[PDB]
């Protein structure tokens, strides 16, 4: 995308043209085989705006003078966006069934905090020290 | 009658001086609300202390991310040209 | 708002100089010469930078400037990355040369930061009235 | 060894405060968050009878003074050096059991003379 | 929205025009792919009013000098609102089955506190230090 | 409502006009998408009267010098009312099934104490220090 | 492939011709007997670009002077790509059933971390010390 | 085979004739009664090339001057190849069912790590000290 | 950068004057006298061939990831030049570990000024007066 998702903050996102936003939306839609086609544009936009906000407010700053967002900020924001869209869609499907057959997925259910609860969140969680607390500070 | 907290008595209290000195030494800015409790601001009249960060030693101390020369903790107001 | 700023402006450097505040100024604010050894908050687009104010001052008080050849913590009004050149934004913050109308900066970002965060930067130049 | 002892006393001879912040497996605390905690517990601002009030997720741990026998190391260095220079151990302000009196004293003072 | 959900108190919400409320409601409805279209306006207004009230009474103030609402207050109040609407709908659906077609979601035994019991609640919880108690005071 | 549910005690509730009570009942009915429309007025009035009484007797007074009702007293009393109505309806449905399909909710567990046992009770419980015992007192 | 997946960084991937990318995509498609043929070209490209970015940021650097990527960087990046494509498809299937038979795969996860969640991730994880922390460093 | 699989490194495999590769592919296909006939040649070639690379990078060197690959390096590389092919086919079958009957296998929930997940991996694992850490080293 | 004396080769000391020594992480292996630029948070790498990539010169040979001492601006340095230079020439990192003139480069401003002239491949003495970063 012309502006990349890591280059824009919450106020910048609001200032983008529809096309600049649609480029980023289209990139987020690459992270699912279904593309979440049955979810409308406003909801995808809201998920991205919200992911940008959380990146800048929850997953920013430094930790023992290391960056908190240690991984690629582009893919972190896209995975955080995909996590949000999948939660607006009601969560991970553990199983799906109908006339076309049945499938059951290896989700395991061991996750209990927010980012642990979907595959996109579990990917995003590697970019940010797995939410570990390695901050350290000194007196002088 | 005058209590220790009563407004006419505050200048006589050893603690009122000591904690105002403590606040001057401990601030980074004149913006009290971001730094001190409503309790501290009222009890020690911190609006009237000249708080601005200029008397905090840590305003003047080098705190470099990579310190090759073992030079962190040095205070600039102790250099020969000061 | 919380206006959170437990921030030591000086990282490293000897190069602090004395001026008179031409208005009330705040720690980490970029300033320029508004009168004979008098300093005021920088406007945008690169005609106006001498250094950053270390600590809060009222109008007419003596002020310590972190000049160039010095390292500082400064708030950015946009996302910035290592090697970005930056200069005063007019809003009491810095922004990139890339965002500004100016062609050249006054500090170099050494540690990146998101919009409204504090970056770590090395000040390397000053800017004045060229017409 | 004198330089080693002096440096070891500075690092290890005194207790040091270690405040740990946040719940274990909880929300992470960043450097700017620790700055506001450092302000509350700053040893320069602390005085002997300061009391602390906290939630459950703040721990005031201690690096204990880590005991080592620098006295015995100093005695060993002095015993090495004094004997190397041919002096009695006593010239170094160090002593030993069973060497203070009788034939054991008479011999070391005969050797010195 | 013209006034944002983080800019308004409980008294302000009551003082807003119907359009200003409807803009905020429309924003909250973006957080579900279904938009909770079968739940009436009054209930969505009550959920938002309650979320604003609960933010300002229950997730406000400081722990040490740090604010207790660390993340973006907009998305916090929206996720807290969405949590309330989903509880007014009866809770998370763990499983749904219709005309043969069936789905099961990876909700699991996520916890027992209020915010742990919904996906929106688990998201909101990350903005407020995960309800941890990092508060500290000292004597003078 | 004209008098708010936090402004009335049990004897005040009895003294209200039918319309003033109906305004408060209507506010409680917003907390469920179903409105409990198949449960009669007398039962909703009894639940509210009981919530007011139970607030004033069990969820009142200080712990240390803090109010035991930390959150908004309005929404606390409304959630406590909704909790009671949901118990008069038989408890939380964990699963529902018929001609129109099946749904299972994530409302499993719910601890052992009454407020833990429905979603409205779990919400109410956050307003009141989660029923924890933080009271301290001294000699002089 | 002409340039190999281990020879290209994120910017290099963007600089490749469509043919050089399609060769790398074709190599990744060898890692599944299904070839993920129902996923579009853009999604496979996004998964590879992400795997390259994630390798260079999360699985790079030294660890007690040992390189953190100990195994072959080619096959590591391919398995990390296949892991991502499999997560864009859902999870791993634990079970599949339909008109033509049924099967169950013993794809039970080794734990809650992202790489543990698919067979490709479990393979990739052996190339990188199983995500262990063997770093060591001295004062001088 | 004329060149044996233990005699070829990754660059040697790429340099083999198609017949020399097909002799090695044929040998790997003997390790399953099904031969994996419905999986194409290029997938089998990718599995073997990957097994060669992974042998040379993850299962090479010494522990206490003992070779880390203690068993026959031929059969280790063949089992490592078969492990990879079986994972490209989706994993172990735990259970299979259809018109021709049903069978369930003693797969029994094998452990968390890569080689533990299939029968071929469990065989390969005996050749490499079961991935144990018996290395020892001295100062002089 | 090397001086020859009989059989012997001596490394030249890079830093002639100044005290603007400042410490960074090596983003790659680097050798004494190379021009470098910021490549990540407090991380420095060898400068590319035109403008916008200079923070200082590396003072000693390093493996990747080691801490690097730089001479920054406000220093006089001994540096190898890839072309003939004269006093008053502005010079710029060359992309080859050397410097070259601004006149030769695609850029329009230097980072150091030549104080003593030198032939291609010889050691120049120059004063570092500026850094260069991403302006876009
Ligand atoms: K502008
Ligand atoms: K005191
Ligand atoms: K050129
Ligand atoms: Mg968390
Ligand atoms: Mg190795
Ligand atoms: Mg000089």
TrEMBL record, chains A, E, F, G, H:
Binding annotation for Mg(2+) 1: 70
Start and end residues of each stretch annotated as Disordered: 91-111
Entry annotated with the keyword Protease: no
Alphabetical UniProt keywords: Metal-binding
Low complexity composition-biased segments: 91-106
Binding of Mg(2+) 2, residues: 126, 130-131
Protein name: HK97 gp6-like/SPP1 gp15-like head-tail connector
Organism of origin: Haloferax tailed virus 1
Automatic annotation (TrEMBL), chain C:
Protein name: Capsid stabilization protein
Species for this entry: Haloferax tailed virus 1 (HFTV1)
Binding locations of Mg(2+) 2: 14-15
UniProt entry keywords in alphabetical sequence: Metal-binding
Amino-acid positions noted as binding Mg(2+) 3 in the UniProt annotation, renumbered to this chain: 68-69
Automatic annotation (TrEMBL), chain D:
Protein name: Portal protein
Organism field: Haloferax tailed virus 1 (HFTV1)
Full-length numbering of the shown residues: 226 to 338 of 675
Automatic annotation (TrEMBL), chain I:
Residues reported to bind Mg(2+) 1: 3
UniProt: Mg(2+) 2 binding residues: 19-20
Source species: Haloferax tailed virus 1
Binding sites annotated in the UniProt record for Mg(2+) 3: 73-74
Listed name of the protein: Capsid stabilization protein
Keyword vocabulary terms for this entry: Metal-binding
